[PDB]
């Protein structure tokens, strides 16, 4: 009775220990993958700025070397003129200007001295101008090098954040691979992961509603204002932005393979296939290299960019009329909540966030708060 | 005599044109031409500055025309009027008395 | 008819002094007036000519100069030609100028 009672309390202690050790490793995984995402995004933006700056710095060094050659040539030529003037005694023995003069030959000989003094003035002015352009281009170059160094310092810091986060993630996942998860609590995590994802989308939607409702009204006003056009015998040309507003708010339309492939790769899982037990896939899984760019399937606005258990880094794009595209397992979110996106625009990089076995994209289309087979929108 | 100096930009043909053009402008008996290359020779020979012009990357001298007026156009007012005639042929730089 | 000689610009003070001593030792030479590269520049610098030119040059553009004053009995045409021949063979001499006249 005594030792059966010790082992019952040390078998509940041991389950509450296992559950909290897992919870804590998953909260570490979340933080690490949040850091990998934010750092991967920064390194990408940083590297793109740097490529422009390096090209400018290359151009400035080439331009400065050209002027420096010009300046050395102009200096040597000017110095040779000073030397010849000195050998002539032009600085003391000007006397040869005076005793050598005639009626009309001396007239011209004066004009000629005018053209020489002019040419010498121009020679010095040209060199003064080369020295000023050089000095200015060097000042400009030093300011560009200083900008580049601040950027390389940011790259270093972000890389350090990324390397740390990756090293710590390797250790967190090895830990999670230790805690063997039996069939029934996997199914339990899968159902709860799906439920939490649903709550996150609803909250993102609730927070978008004021904006979404105004844009829809404003969008319909454009369609309407084109009724007075048609029905009163004219055409109204909507502005490029009114066309963007209508695209972002009109929903994904009837599934006719008009949307962009978010990523191209083998289809590893399809909507409705068995996930585990009686649970079905609510989206498709497309295989692709880690870091492969994930494209918005259509015009819309980002309303969620969060790490969710089971799904990792999830981006949701509002398309209007309650239509949403959902992008999970991401290495990095490349766009922030509230950013408008264009069909075909990179919004994320493929990864395995949330602890997937291989790099891939999780992809949903949702209508009326329900995941639907996303396949028949995919074409281009 | 009034000396006129040509724009330095005149090529061989354009110079020949100016030479032909000033042959019979009113009050002018004759006009003597010195090449850019001859004008330069003359400075090096006679200025006592030697090669001072030669030390420049470009010849700084123009080809030149010395206007010898006709005997009946050698008075003060005559020279002013015939000087004013040169101004109406665009392509001369400076006129000196 | 003084002969003006211009030295190679790579000559140091000693090498210049050597050339000056060789000119002084030559047959028919009364005296040699020498101007340093540094003194030649000092003298030229007074000149208003080429205004602002020297402020833009890091390097002394001028040679050292030595004015070879022949003795009165070696101021004839053939005397000056022979002295010129010997001066031109002295190492460190760049250019030799005979009096204007």
CATH number at residue C48: 3.30.70.3040
Q: Hey, what are A83's tokens?
A: 């030397």
Q: How many domains does chain C have?
A: 1
Taking the Cβ of residue B49 and every Cβ of chain A, the question of whether any pair is shorter than 8 Å is answered with: yes
Spatial distance between the Cα atoms of B92 and B22, rounded to a whole number of angstroms: 11
Dihedral over Cα of B72, B75, B81, B85: its sign? positive
| Phi, psi torsion values for A269, nearest 5 degrees | -140, 140
Alpha-carbon distance of B47 to B45, in angstroms, equals 6
Q: How far apart are CA A257 and CA A298, in angstroms?
A: 11
| Partner-chain residue, chosen from A96, A124, A128, that has the shortest CB–CB distance to C50 | A124
CB contact under 8 A, C50 and A83: no
Determination method here?
X-ray
Residue C76 is encoded by which pair of tokens? 């004839």
Token reading at B37: 């290359």
Query: Chain A contact for B96, CB < 8 A?
Result: yes
Distance CA B38, CA B49 (A): 16
SS3 B69: strand
How far apart (Å, rounded) are the C-alpha atoms in residues A288 and A356? Answer: 13
Evaluate the CA torsion angle A92, A93, A94, A99 in order and state its sign.
Answer: positive
3-class DSSP assignment, residue A273 = coil
Residue in A310, A347, A307 with CA at minimum distance from that of residue A325? A347
The residue range of the domain holding C46 is 3-97
Looking at the domain assignment, is residue B67 inside a domain?
Answer: yes
Residue A114 token pair: 């005018």
Asked if residue B21 is part of any domain, the answer here is yes
List all chains that touch chain C, counting a touch as 3 or more CB pairs closer than 8 Å: A
Tell me if chain B has a CB within 8 Å of the CB of A100: yes
Residue B74 tokens, joined: 């050698």
How many CB atoms within 10 Å of residue A163?
Answer: 11
CA B32 to chain A, closest CA, distance in angstroms equals 12
Nearest Cα of chain C lies from the Cα of A349 at a distance, in angstroms, of 57
* Contacts of B among chains (3+ CB pairs under 8 A): A
CA–centroid distance for A269 within its chain: 29
For residue B34, the chain A residue with the least C-alpha distance is A108
- Residue among C60, C59, C7 nearest C32 (CA): C7
**Residue B80 placed within a domain:** yes
Task: Dump the DSSP string for A242-254.
Answer: HHHHHHHHS-S-S
Could you tell me the two tokens for A28? 């570490």
DSSP code at position A260: P
Residue A123 phi/psi, 5-degree rounding, is -55, -50
Contact A351, A32 (CB under 8 A): no
User: Does the residue B24 lie in any domain?
Assistant: yes
Do the chains contact at C50 and A127, CB–CB below 8 Å? no
Tell me if B95 is assigned to some domain: no
Resolution in angstroms for this experimental structure? 2.1
Compute CA C34 distance to the chain's CA centroid, rounded to the nearest angstrom.
7
Q: How far apart are CA A210 and CA A222, in angstroms?
A: 19
From B48, B51, B53, residue closest to A96, measured CB to CB = B48
Contacts of A370 (CB under 8 A, 6+ apart): none
First to last CA, chain B: 7
DSSP state of A225: H
Q: Is the dihedral of CA A127, A129, A135, A140 positive or negative?
A: negative
For B92, the 3-state DSSP assignment is strand
Domains, chain A, with CATH or none:
2-92+111-177 (1.10.287), 187-377 (2.70.70.10)
Whole-angstrom Cα distance, residue B43 to residue A106? Answer: 10
Chain A residues with CB inside 8 Å of B96's CB?
A: 107, 111
Tally of helices (H runs) and strands (E runs) in chain C: 3, 4
Q: What's the half-sphere exposure (Cβ side, CA atoms, 13 Å) at A47? A: 8
Cβ-based contacts of B94 with chain A (< 8 Å):
111
Helix (H, G, I), strand (E, B) or coil at B57: coil
Residue B94 forms part of a structural domain: no
Spatial CA neighbour of A138 closest among A76, A71, A57: A57
Least Cα distance to B65 among B43, B28, B53 occurs for: B28
> Using the 8-state DSSP alphabet, how is residue A372 labeled?
E
Question: B39, B64 in Cβ contact below 8 A?
Answer: yes
Whether B93 is in a domain gets the answer no
Q: For residue A357, what is the DSSP state?
A: S
d(CA A358, CA A349): 14
Q: Is C101 on the interface with A (CB under 8 A)?
A: no
Contact B49 A90 (CB under 8 A): yes
Task: Walk across the sheet containing A346-349 and list its strands.
Answer: A293-295, A346-349, A332-333
Residue among A238, A253, A236, A364 at smallest CA distance from A299? A253
CB A142 within 8 A of CB A61: no
Q: Which of B91, B87, B71 is nearest to B7 (CA)?
A: B91
Measured distance CA(C80)–CA(C84) in Å, rounded: 6
Is the CB of residue A90 less than 8 Å away from at least one CB of chain C?
yes
Residue A34: phi, psi to the nearest 5?
A: -65, -45
Handedness of CA C86, C88, C89, C91 (dihedral sign): positive
CB A127 within 8 Å of CB A78? yes
Q: Which residue has the tokens 């012009």?
A: B53
Instruction: DSSP letter for B90, please.
Output: B
d(CA C73, CA A315): 107
Whole-angstrom CA distances from A365 to A13, B50, C72 are 43, 91, 114
Q: Residue A65: how many CA atoms within 13 Å on its side-chain side?
A: 6
Question: Quick one: tokens of B96?
Answer: 């000196």
Could you give phi then psi for residue A285, rounded to 5 degrees?
A: -115, 120
User: Smallest Cα–Cα separation from B54: which of C4, A116, C5?
Assistant: A116
Element (H, E) at A318: strand A312-320
Pair A315, A335: CB distance under 8 Å: yes
Q: What is the spatial distance between Cα B66 and Cα B38, in angstroms, rounded to a whole number?
A: 14
């Amino acid at each position: 009775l005594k030792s059966i009672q010790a082992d019952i309390a040390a078998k509940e202690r041991a389950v509450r220990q296992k559950q909290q050790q897992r919870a804590s490793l998953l909260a570490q995984l979340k933080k690490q993958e949040e850091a990998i995402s934010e750092a991967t995004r920064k390194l990408r933006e940083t590297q793109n700025t740097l490529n422009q700056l390096n090209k400018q710095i290359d151009e400035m060094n080439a331009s400065i070397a050209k002027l420096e050659q010009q300046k050395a040539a102009q200096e040597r030529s000017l110095a040779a003129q000073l030397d010849a003037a000195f050998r002539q005694g032009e600085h003391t023995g000007i006397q040869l200007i005076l005793s050598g003069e005639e009626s009309q030959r001396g007239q011209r000989l004066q004009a000629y001295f005018g053209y020489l003094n002019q040419a010498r003035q121009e020679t010095i002015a040209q060199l003064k101008q080369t020295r000023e352009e050089v000095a200015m281009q060097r000042a400009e170059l030093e300011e560009k090098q200083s900008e580049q160094q601040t950027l390389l310092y940011e790259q270093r810091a972000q890389q350090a954040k990324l390397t740390q986060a990756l090293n710590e993630r390797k250790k967190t996942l090895a830990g999670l691979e230790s805690s063997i998860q039996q069939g029934q609590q996997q199914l339990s995590e899968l159902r709860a992961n799906e439920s939490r994802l649903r709550n996150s989308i609803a909250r993102a939607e609730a927070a978008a509603k004021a904006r979404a409702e105004r844009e829809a009204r404003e969008a319909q006003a454009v369609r309407d204002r084109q009724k007075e056009a048609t029905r009163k015998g004219t055409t109204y040309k909507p502005t490029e932005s009114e066309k963007s507003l209508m695209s972002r708010t009109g929903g994904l339309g009837a599934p006719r393979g008009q949307a962009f492939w978010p990523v191209r790769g083998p289809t590893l899982h399809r909507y409705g296939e068995q996930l585990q037990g009686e649970l079905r896939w609510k989206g498709m899984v497309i295989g692709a290299s880690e870091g492969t760019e994930v494209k918005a399937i259509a015009d819309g606005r980002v309303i969620l960019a969060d790490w969710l258990q089971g799904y990792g880094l999830v981006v949701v794009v509002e398309h209007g009329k309650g239509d949403m595209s959902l992008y999970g397992y991401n290495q990095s979110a490349l766009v922030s909540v509230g950013s408008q996106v264009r069909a075909g625009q990179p919004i994320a990089l493929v990864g395995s966030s949330g602890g997937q076995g291989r790099p891939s994209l999780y992809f949903e289309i949702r209508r009326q708060g329900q995941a639907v087979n996303p396949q028949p929108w995919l074409g281009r | 005599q009034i000396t006129v100096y040509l724009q330095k930009t005149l090529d061989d043909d354009a110079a020949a044109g100016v030479v032909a053009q000033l042959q019979a402008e009113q009050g002018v008996e004759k006009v003597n031409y010195l090449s850019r290359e001859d004008a330069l020779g003359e400075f090096r020979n006679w200025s006592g500055f030697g090669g001072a012009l030669d030390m420049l990357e470009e010849n700084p001298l123009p080809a030149v025309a010395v206007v010898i007026p006709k005997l009946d156009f050698q008075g003060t007012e005559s020279l002013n009027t015939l000087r004013d005639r040169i101004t109406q042929i665009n392509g001369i730089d400076e006129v000196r008395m």
